[PDB]
Amino acid sequence: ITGRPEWIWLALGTALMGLGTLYFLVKGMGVSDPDAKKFYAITTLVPAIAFTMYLSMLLGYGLTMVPFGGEQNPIYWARYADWLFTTPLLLLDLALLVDADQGTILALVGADGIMIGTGLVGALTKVYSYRFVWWAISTAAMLYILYVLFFGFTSKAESMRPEVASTFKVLRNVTVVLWSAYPVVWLIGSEGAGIVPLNIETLLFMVLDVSAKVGFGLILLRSRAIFGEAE
Amino acid sequence: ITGRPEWIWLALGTALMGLGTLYFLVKGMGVSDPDAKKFYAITTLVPAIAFTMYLSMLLGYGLTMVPFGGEQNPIYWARYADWLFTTPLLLLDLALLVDADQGTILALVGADGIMIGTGLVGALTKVYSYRFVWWAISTAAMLYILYVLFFGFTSKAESMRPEVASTFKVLRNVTVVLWSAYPVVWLIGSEGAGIVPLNIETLLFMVLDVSAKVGFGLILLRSRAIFGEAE
Amino acid sequence: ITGRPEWIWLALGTALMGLGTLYFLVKGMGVSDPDAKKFYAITTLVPAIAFTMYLSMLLGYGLTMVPFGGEQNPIYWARYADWLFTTPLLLLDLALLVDADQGTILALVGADGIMIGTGLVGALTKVYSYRFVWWAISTAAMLYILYVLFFGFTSKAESMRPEVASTFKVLRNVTVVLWSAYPVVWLIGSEGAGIVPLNIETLLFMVLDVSAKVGFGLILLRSRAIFGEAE
Ligand SMILES: CC(C)CCC[C@@H](C)CCC[C@@H](C)CCC[C@@H](C)CCOC[C@@H](CO)OCC[C@H](C)CCC[C@H](C)CCC[C@H](C)CCCC(C)C
Ligand SMILES: CC(C)CCC[C@@H](C)CCC[C@@H](C)CCC[C@@H](C)CCOC[C@@H](CO)OCC[C@H](C)CCC[C@H](C)CCC[C@H](C)CCCC(C)C
Ligand SMILES: CC(C)CCC[C@@H](C)CCC[C@@H](C)CCC[C@@H](C)CCOC[C@@H](CO)OCC[C@H](C)CCC[C@H](C)CCC[C@H](C)CCCC(C)C
Ligand SMILES: *C/C=C(C)/C=C/C=C(C)/C=C/C1=C(C)CCCC1(C)C
Ligand SMILES: *C/C=C(C)/C=C/C=C(C)/C=C/C1=C(C)CCCC1(C)C
Ligand SMILES: *C/C=C(C)/C=C/C=C(C)/C=C/C1=C(C)CCCC1(C)C
Ligand SMILES: CCCCCCCCCCCCCCC
Ligand SMILES: CCCCCCCCCCCCCCC
Ligand SMILES: CCCCCCCCCCCCCCC
Ligand SMILES: CCCCCCCCCCCCCCC
Ligand SMILES: CCCCCCCCCCCCCCC
Ligand SMILES: CCCCCCCCCCCCCCC
Ligand SMILES: CCCCCCCCCCCCCC
Ligand SMILES: CCCCCCCCCCCCCC
Ligand SMILES: CCCCCCCCCCCCC
Ligand SMILES: CCCCCCCCCCCCC
Ligand SMILES: CCCCCCCCCCCCC
Ligand SMILES: CCCCCCCCCCC
Ligand SMILES: CCCCCCCCCCC
Ligand SMILES: CCCCCCCCCCC
Ligand SMILES: CCCCCCCCCC
Ligand SMILES: CCCCCCCCCC
Ligand SMILES: CCCCCCCCCC
Ligand SMILES: CCCCCCCCC
Ligand SMILES: CCCCCCCCC
Ligand SMILES: CCCCCCCCC
Ligand SMILES: CCCCCCCC
Ligand SMILES: CCCCCCCC
Ligand SMILES: CCCCCCCC
Ligand SMILES: CCCCCCCC
Ligand SMILES: CCCCCCCC
Ligand SMILES: CCCCCCCC
Ligand SMILES: CCCCCCCC
């Protein structure tokens, strides 16, 4: 484990995702509202999945070597197995908050799968220049997601209860800022141009992951928007 | 790229799926009917997924070598990753058109997963004679799907609006004819008996894919069956 | 095939899953109740999936070698591909029986995915002591599932029709007893401590699989709880 300088950030990430999972699990014990139960189930699964994948990276299972640039490059593939399941769950939290229609939910989840799937292909591609073709396709899929979150959901939240509109607006802004950083870290990190070393890259993804999952969840599950209007 | 004679058909397929995706995306911009939005989302995702997998084959990522018959045989595995997601989406288009019940939808999607999954196992199997055992199981799963589309959905469409009944009947006939060709191309192509060479096999799958996805989508999204009855 | 002593139990399992699939398929022909169709579709898919994965193990495709303990250990990875899809389908049978809320269904299916996913990682892990870390995480996920089936569903079934309450109680008890045996067989078998040899381990999993899928299905599909109350 300790033979890799980035191990400290993988261990911290593992701990923070595990602690986040347990807090949400305990906090959700005393909840019977069927609407609130939906948000607790979605939001608790997110850091639980991330916990297992951070642990796999810490123990060395989620790491492979990819030859490109005449070098064997360490690629943590477990990140994409994490994101494949956690990013659509996070979008479902937002879509259920605004009572989005089914067709829009399917478009979001499908574009998200394309985003993560093409990012994985780009991470494992051995022809250096082709890695950035996949990065560009994946980034186009992300821009579609961000467009929908702004010019489809925002207008839908305003016609909703005030507390669900204000909570959505906050979580929307958090998501757009944090998610946009991921393609940048990829491009300048060891998967892309190799400007930033792997140990610093790992620290950046850990800060982003914890903020986008645990921080996101703390804002959502403390809001009254997750409960139905009741007397 | 150009070192493979089949590259021209992979490049054409990539272009036609990309163009198809963009047309459906633009055409769906001016749509607010929640029913129509469902069909546009399903139908636009189909060629978008196929685009990415054709590109992976063009660039050489979606290709592996499988030893059988005393030879290293080029097997494009990316086809099955495509079909795993696009064939159930196409069946969902048909099932939603006739307002199929949930139990029937689950049976269709499950049989479809078995069809594609066993076809993938057959494509990667190293014992030559066993490849055709998997082909037979996969073909049995397809025949179940075709039976349901005829002796379960057809009777349901007649009790529906006339425009949804006539549109379903057309898309049903297109699907049964085109899908039935796939097991035949597999059997006589490089995955099976090896009668037809890979470059011709690739041309045939490209014609079938574009027809079953883009051609299918053009018929559906030009129909009024996708809109609810409104004044 | 016959070069492996466990082949006899893989062949028996294949036959019993295939026969089970055909019986459920025939029995479900004469069913039009939309509620009953749901249970028949879920319950017939379970042994059909298991059939294909037992066949892959029989023919040698679903087997790999994992080095640990200074030895190349035969690991049947196809079991986890089976369980990944069949265990959530079995939980869906139970959840639909008691009309569970959506949030609870998602929590069950998500915990089940974590259970199977971490068990697969543990089966393929090359550092011997780490294999049991994954076993423990997977077992914690199972205990969560069992808790929900007892202290969330049981109370919900009592407020239901008497026949659905008594049928659920029976299937609940069958599930908790049979599922609990799996982590024990893993721990003492070739994936874990290696006390029980592989051929005996394979026999035990076959008895458990057939009972948990075909036996489970025979109890459910003979009950009147799967039909709506009708005159
Ligand atoms: C509606 C939305 C959900 C739609 C989703 C969008 C999606 C279509 C976007 C594209 C996804 C696609 C790129 C997934 C590729 C997975 C692949 C990286 C797995 C590893 O295989 C890659 C190479 C080794 O580098 O295999 C070496 C050769 C091996 C012999 C490969 C044989 C196994 C194949 C991988 C079998 C295909 C399985 C499916 C891809 C499983 C789904 C994985 C997940 C990442 C989507
Ligand atoms: C309700 C419906 C959706 C049900 C679906 C029906 C489905 C059950 C039908 C059978 C599907 C099954 C054959 C999928 C097999 C995937 C497999 C080809 C992936 C590549 O692995 C094959 C060998 C190399 O040749 O791995 C070499 C050895 C490696 C060490 C393998 C270890 C990884 C395992 C593959 C882990 C299992 C992952 C799941 C199979 C992922 C789903 C893939 C998709 C193709 C279903
Ligand atoms: C809501 C719920 C459904 C959530 C589900 C819970 C889930 C997150 C729990 C953890 C699942 C995770 C451990 C799955 C790992 C699959 C992995 C074993 C496949 C084989 O790859 C392992 C190594 C060889 O040993 O690959 C060698 C290196 C290769 C180069 C690997 C590159 C391919 C990657 C495997 C791509 C990721 C694909 C996804 C993991 C596909 C889903 C598989 C299924 C088992 C979940
Ligand atoms: C909890 C994890 C989250 C919210 C991860 C989000 C990840 C992304 C938005 C990743 C995007 C990428 C691109 C847009 C292209 C480059 C490759 C990716 C996958 C890093
Ligand atoms: C857009 C792609 C489509 C509609 C693909 C359809 C593919 C099939 C219907 C494939 C069927 C197969 C068999 C029936 C057995 C032989 C292997 C397959 C997977 C080619
Ligand atoms: C039809 C198959 C069924 C119902 C299989 C159930 C399997 C389990 C409940 C497996 C549980 C495991 C653990 C709890 C940890 C050890 C590894 C597993 C996956 C065997
Ligand atoms: C979206 C965030 C990207 C900003 C990356 C900042 C990295 C600064 C760290 C110093 C770079 C290390 C280079 C010298 C080793
Ligand atoms: C009462 C609110 C705080 C509860 C404690 C939460 C502990 C989980 C770890 C959170 C750290 C990361 C927060 C986002 C920066
Ligand atoms: C379902 C369509 C299958 C028909 C295949 C027709 C192939 C004819 C092309 C000529 C065969 C090439 C053999 C000589 C190289
Ligand atoms: C107005 C209808 C035609 C629009 C142009 C569609 C261009 C997408 C490519 C379609 C070619 C394949 C059609 C099926 C044979
Ligand atoms: C949950 C069931 C686990 C019980 C396992 C009993 C196995 C007894 C078979 C004899 C053990 C073989 C050891 C000598 C070869
Ligand atoms: C009339 C009920 C029996 C029908 C025959 C079922 C045959 C399928 C194989 C069942 C054997 C396994 C039963 C569970 C132990
Ligand atoms: C194995 C991959 C299957 C999933 C394909 C994605 C489409 C799923 C459609 C689900 C239809 C709704 C069923 C109720
Ligand atoms: C990782 C594979 C999980 C999918 C298994 C297929 C069954 C899914 C059941 C979904 C139940 C409906 C939830 C609302
Ligand atoms: C185009 C939709 C408007 C909202 C999206 C904001 C774009 C942020 C740019 C992200 C940069 C990634 C490289
Ligand atoms: C048996 C259901 C009737 C409709 C299915 C038509 C069968 C077409 C044969 C396809 C040939 C594939 C080898
Ligand atoms: C803790 C929830 C109560 C019901 C679960 C029964 C636990 C059975 C123990 C299984 C042993 C697996 C190692
Ligand atoms: C080795 C660098 C080659 C540059 C390729 C950049 C491709 C980016 C595509 C974005 C449209
Ligand atoms: C090398 C050819 C061996 C023939 C096997 C055919 C199997 C087909 C099974 C269809 C029932
Ligand atoms: C080689 C045996 C090492 C023992 C590790 C046991 C780990 C079990 C963790 C359960 C909390
Ligand atoms: C609940 C605390 C979980 C912390 C265990 C993971 C941290 C790795 C320490 C080496
Ligand atoms: C929108 C046009 C997309 C065409 C790019 C793919 C074709 C491959 C050319 C080499
Ligand atoms: C319907 C009977 C299915 C039996 C075939 C599988 C058994 C393997 C025999 C070698
Ligand atoms: C993106 C930063 C999240 C901050 C988490 C703190 C929330 C406390 C209510
Ligand atoms: C299967 C052939 C499809 C033909 C596509 C043309 C549709 C234009 C309305
Ligand atoms: C767990 C044992 C199941 C027994 C199956 C027999 C059911 C006949 C109704
Ligand atoms: C009005 C809410 C502002 C939230 C933005 C937070 C950016 C990290
Ligand atoms: C909408 C604000 C985008 C912020 C992008 C930050 C990328 C590091
Ligand atoms: C009555 C519609 C006929 C459609 C069949 C088209 C076959 C390619
Ligand atoms: C229902 C007509 C089937 C046509 C099969 C064509 C196979 C090449
Ligand atoms: C295995 C075939 C079953 C025969 C019919 C059983 C009575 C519905
Ligand atoms: C009251 C029903 C008892 C069922 C338990 C069966 C254990 C195999
Ligand atoms: C609730 C009874 C548990 C039985 C466990 C059996 C494990 C072999």
CSV table of N, CA and C and ligand atoms in Angstrom, one decimal, chain B residues 139 142-143 146-147 150-151 180 183, ligand 16:
chain,number,residue,atom,x,y,z
B,139,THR,N,-30.5,-17.8,-30.4
B,139,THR,CA,-31.5,-17.8,-31.4
B,139,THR,C,-32.9,-18.2,-30.8
B,142,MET,N,-34.2,-15.1,-29.3
B,142,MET,CA,-34.8,-14.2,-30.3
B,142,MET,C,-36.2,-14.7,-30.8
B,143,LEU,N,-36.3,-16.0,-31.0
B,143,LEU,CA,-37.6,-16.5,-31.4
B,143,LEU,C,-38.7,-16.2,-30.4
B,146,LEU,N,-39.7,-12.5,-30.9
B,146,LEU,CA,-40.5,-12.4,-32.1
B,146,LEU,C,-41.9,-12.9,-31.9
B,147,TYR,N,-42.0,-14.0,-31.2
B,147,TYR,CA,-43.4,-14.5,-30.9
B,147,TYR,C,-44.2,-13.5,-30.1
B,150,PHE,N,-45.6,-10.6,-32.0
B,150,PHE,CA,-46.7,-11.0,-33.0
B,150,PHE,C,-47.9,-11.5,-32.2
B,151,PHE,N,-47.8,-12.3,-31.2
B,151,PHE,CA,-48.9,-12.9,-30.6
B,151,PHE,C,-49.1,-12.4,-29.1
B,180,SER,N,-34.0,-10.8,-37.8
B,180,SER,CA,-33.8,-12.2,-38.2
B,180,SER,C,-32.6,-12.4,-39.0
B,183,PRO,N,-28.7,-13.3,-36.9
B,183,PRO,CA,-28.1,-14.6,-36.6
B,183,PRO,C,-27.6,-15.3,-37.9
D,16,LIG,C1,-42.0,-18.4,-34.0
D,16,LIG,C2,-42.6,-17.0,-33.9
D,16,LIG,C3,-43.2,-16.6,-35.2
D,16,LIG,C4,-42.5,-15.3,-35.7
D,16,LIG,C5,-41.0,-15.5,-35.8
D,16,LIG,C6,-40.5,-15.5,-37.3
D,16,LIG,C7,-39.3,-16.5,-37.4
D,16,LIG,C8,-38.2,-16.0,-38.3
D,16,LIG,C9,-37.1,-17.0,-38.5
D,16,LIG,C10,-35.8,-16.3,-38.2
D,16,LIG,C11,-34.7,-17.3,-38.6
D,16,LIG,C12,-33.4,-17.1,-37.7
D,16,LIG,C13,-32.5,-18.2,-37.9
